[PDB]
Amino acid sequence: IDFVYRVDPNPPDVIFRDGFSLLGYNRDLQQLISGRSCAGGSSDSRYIVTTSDINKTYAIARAYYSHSKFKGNLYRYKIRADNNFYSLTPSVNYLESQGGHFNAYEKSMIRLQSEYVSTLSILPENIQKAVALVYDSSTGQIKDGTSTINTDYVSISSVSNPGVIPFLPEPQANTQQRIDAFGSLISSCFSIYSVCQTHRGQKTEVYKMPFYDARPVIQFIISGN
Amino acid sequence: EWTGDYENIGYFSHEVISEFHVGQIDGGAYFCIKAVKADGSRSTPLIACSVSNESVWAPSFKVLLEQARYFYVTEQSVRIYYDHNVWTNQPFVNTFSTNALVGLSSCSAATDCFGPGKP
Amino acid sequence: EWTGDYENIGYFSHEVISEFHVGQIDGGAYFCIKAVKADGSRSTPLIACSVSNESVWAPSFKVLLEQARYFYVTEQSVRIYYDHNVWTNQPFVNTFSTNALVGLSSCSAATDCFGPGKP
Amino acid sequence: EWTGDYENIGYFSHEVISEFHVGQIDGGAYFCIKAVKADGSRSTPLIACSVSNESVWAPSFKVLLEQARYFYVTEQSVRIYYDHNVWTNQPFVNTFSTNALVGLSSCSAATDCFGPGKP
Amino acid sequence: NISDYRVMTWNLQGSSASTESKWNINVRQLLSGTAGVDILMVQEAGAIPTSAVRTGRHIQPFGVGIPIDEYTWNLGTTRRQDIRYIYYSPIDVGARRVNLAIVTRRRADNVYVLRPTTVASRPIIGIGLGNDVFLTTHALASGGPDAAAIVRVTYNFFRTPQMRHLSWLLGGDFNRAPDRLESDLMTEHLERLVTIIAPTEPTQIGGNILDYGVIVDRAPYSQRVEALRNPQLASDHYPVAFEAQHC
Amino acid sequence: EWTGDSSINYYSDEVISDFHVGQFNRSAYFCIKTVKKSGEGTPIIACALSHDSKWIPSFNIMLEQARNFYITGHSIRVYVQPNVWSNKSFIEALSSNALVGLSSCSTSECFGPVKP
Amino acid sequence: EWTGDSSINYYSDEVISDFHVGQFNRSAYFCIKTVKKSGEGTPIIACALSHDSKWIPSFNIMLEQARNFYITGHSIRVYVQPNVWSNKSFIEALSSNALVGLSSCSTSECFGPVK
């Protein structure tokens, strides 16, 4: 899906010059879906997770604007999905064919998050638009603000690559490990510190999002209640 | 009668359940949802409640709870069918709305939503 | 009876359910929740219990059980309605409290919570 | 009867539910849990059973069964209350325990454990 | 961009006719595993691992007309698919001493061949994946007077307007300590344009601090990538890696 | 008089795409709209009323299983008995079929009763 | 009756791969097809009915636990009593076994009435 979205607290002036960068070198697709390699554990994921649904951006913004400890201005960035963007289900199917087990607790967020992961750092030329998200504290509503347009964006025609992520590490045993999540069952890889926030040596000092285990929350909707 | 009357039951599409409340009123078990437009547009809530032991919309209380509890923890696009002027308790009318939660439909983004709709 | 009869039912806003307890007393199931301020300030931890075979708030017991559980695992900020001086058992009133869970509301607004409120 | 009678209900703190079993005995659904200290401080694994039909602790079956099934997926540290010498069936005792699950409390910080304790 | 790939130099430093064994053992230990090197910058290689397959696809090439092969060396067995791509230039198949090569994990979208403004010199290869260009080089062991020259030519070749957005890093043996290189870059007023990344410990048994990298500054997150020495394999030698600083 | 009867039809390799709950005359209907996994054919809509139809005892279990297969996105096989609900406004609105069985399905072969 | 009488036989180190839900006759039934995690084994099919069998009280708990042990791919030990269902069309289609117990299997010992 072309034009995927990412929520970033940095101003457009920073992300239109640097862009989104990889947080490490972990290419495992079993630690990125459960978020143990993104922000809640040994954060070294070799991915930049971006949502394809416009509604997930508002869910992320509402999860950061409702803790009273976060001070900043969030921006939704629209990113043209080139051949380096992969959906998470085609690769999960391949990892299952190779002999790996993704339990329902993870298949039930591969659907919820609508992830389209980028295996390489997002170029500033892929980001087309940045929409400020303003939080009316009295009303408790997040609404779109000034939609700045990048003058660096290169308008080529491309779509997200349909297929398996290359060089995917071999699966592990069925660990049944922690699935880190925040807000309204938003993956921990969508958090602020799931990408390199050290822009030009300077570190963005914002709230560290507290994560909760999602297995109880999914067992709470998948089993009635 | 029926959730999709379209004559008595109104329906707001592409909503997200942002606030959830549970409690008891008059020996029952009521739960209320605050529905706001996904892209911050209408700027006014859609407070809709459902009391377990009162009204003609009572036999579908539990079935409407388990699904609301699903549209709140995930905050997916939802089409809410409500019945207006169902609650008579004036304080309940004041803090909440008169609306009664009647139906919960799943919206597959886009501009279409599964369920009864006006032609 | 109602959860928002303020003059009688109190409530603590912007709380988080940090500890959960489940058990049985006098032939009736019960659960207790411990809440501390989400803002990080200091306040004596609120303890709210709900017996299923006692008091006038039993019809909502299960409704308040599946919700208090969800607000526990998620750690979401929650307004917690309660009625003071409901439980009489001295061994019970000492380890837990005399408060009774009568309502749970989501306070994901950082200013106020959806539901009844004293004016 | 209460899960803090202390004069009977004994608790093991900072447990974690490692094994879960379900079945039927004598026309009644039963579930049993095996708890091992999260700090591998050894201790004969604690096995606590619960039968829906038999025993005094019947009304808190589905409330405990759905809390031993939620503290198991989370692998969260947990205090487990049991009533020693409850089950009489020799084949049932010889495989699981004489223990009867009566209370499931959440524990946190390696200190404290919401619930009835004994000083 | 340039910080997404795990790059390492791995000069051979010939050990009395151990080229095939050192190639096979060392580079297949290095490339394999979860922490395997994505782009490996082997310089002065010469010979071939004797397991590289033939029948590479045709190359134009672009800019300079010396053919570059694309040996598809499969590290894994028949069941596995761990094939690499060694782009190698048969500049001297009778000497096997200065001949450069680059072994990567995926097929290079582009390849390059650039030489300094001096005619007599022989080009520093370099491949490119998408917008990230990894250039392989070789200097002269008599002090390396052409290091500043090769940085200069790389800059004036990648400053072309249609190639301005491309990020580049340069690695190999420079045969000159980094401090002198940055000193005579500051003399030539090229201070803030290229960064020099080197480990803080000597890279040779003789105490030399060679075998570092020079990276274009305008590349996004260029300060993220830092050159550090690998842990002690104790194989009488070691290569440098350009890792990414933890955020 | 069974999920695997000859009157009951079934569709295979299907995923529950849309969900709906509600009330129809003293009952708690729930409807599911499922489509082929990759994609083909018209979407198939199946409902189940709480207090109407022979399929009354299996309302709660089918509701729970449909929600489980909807949250997970599992490729499943849906059993439907055509022409069960008779109101004609339910029929224009959602469907006339009745959900009678849900089975988790796999790559090529999968579980559940199958017609000869 | 009990899950560990003797007439009830168990299969250990099995994972629930396929789940089926339906209605047999005035009663809701659910079936599970469990295969060995290590492989090389005949899948075992176990079914339970709400209103038929001596195993009526344990229908809901077994349904919930079979859903839970199917969501997670945890190795389980399935207890079945053969020849509980009599409708030959039902046995031909799914099985003749009766789900009467589910247990969690840690490497080596499983939790349950071993015999």
Numbering used by the authors:
A (entry chain B): 6 to 230
B (entry chain F), C (entry chain G), D (entry chain C): 1 to 119
E (entry chain A): 5 to 251
F (entry chain E): 1 to 116
G (entry chain D): 1 to 115
What are the paper's exact sentences on this?
In this study, we identified and characterized a typhoid toxin-like A2B5 toxin, designated diarizonae toxin (DiaT), as a key virulence factor in Salmonella diarizonae. The DiaT genomic islet encodes two distinct B subunits, PltBd1 and PltBd2, which exhibit unique functional roles. Through genetic and functional analyses, we demonstrate that the heteropentameric assembly of PltBd1 and PltBd2 is essential for cytotoxicity, with our data suggesting PltBd1 facilitates toxin secretion and PltBd2 mediates host cell targeting. The holotoxin consists of a pentameric B subunit arrangement supporting a single PltA subunit, with the amphipathic C-terminal tail of PltA extending into the central pore formed by the B subunits.
To validate the structural insights from the cryo-EM map of the endogenously expressed DiaT holotoxin, we recombinantly expressed PltBd1 homopentameric holotoxin, PltBd2 homopentameric holotoxin, and PltBd1/PltBd2 heteropentameric holotoxin in E. coli. Cryo-EM analysis resolved these structures at resolutions of 3.05 Å, 2.61 Å, and 2.94 Å, respectively. Additionally, recombinant co-expression of PltBd1, PltBd2, PltA, and CdtB in Escherichia coli similarly demonstrated the presence of the heteropentameric holotoxin (S1G). Notably, the heteropentameric holotoxin purified from E. coli exhibited an identical composition and assembly to the endogenous DiaT holotoxin purified from S. diarizonae. Structural analysis confirmed consistent and distinct amino acid differences that enable the differentiation of PltBd1 and PltBd2 in the endogenous DiaT holotoxin, further reinforcing their reliability as markers for B subunit identification. Three tightly packed PltBd1 subunits were connected with dimeric PltBd2 subunits to form the heteropentamer in the holotoxin structure. The stronger hydrophobic interactions between PltBd2 and PltA, along with additional polar interactions involving PltBd1 and PltA, establish a finely balanced assembly that facilitates the stable accommodation of PltA’s C-terminal tail by the heteropentameric B subunits. Although PltBd1 and PltBd2 can individually form homopentamers, the heteropentamer is preferentially selected by PltA, likely due to its enhanced structural compatibility and complementary interactions. All holotoxins demonstrated cytotoxic activity, but the PltBd2 homopentamer exhibited the highest potency, approximately threefold greater than the PltBd1/PltBd2 heteropentameric toxin (DiaT) and nearly 75-fold greater than the PltBd1 homopentamer.
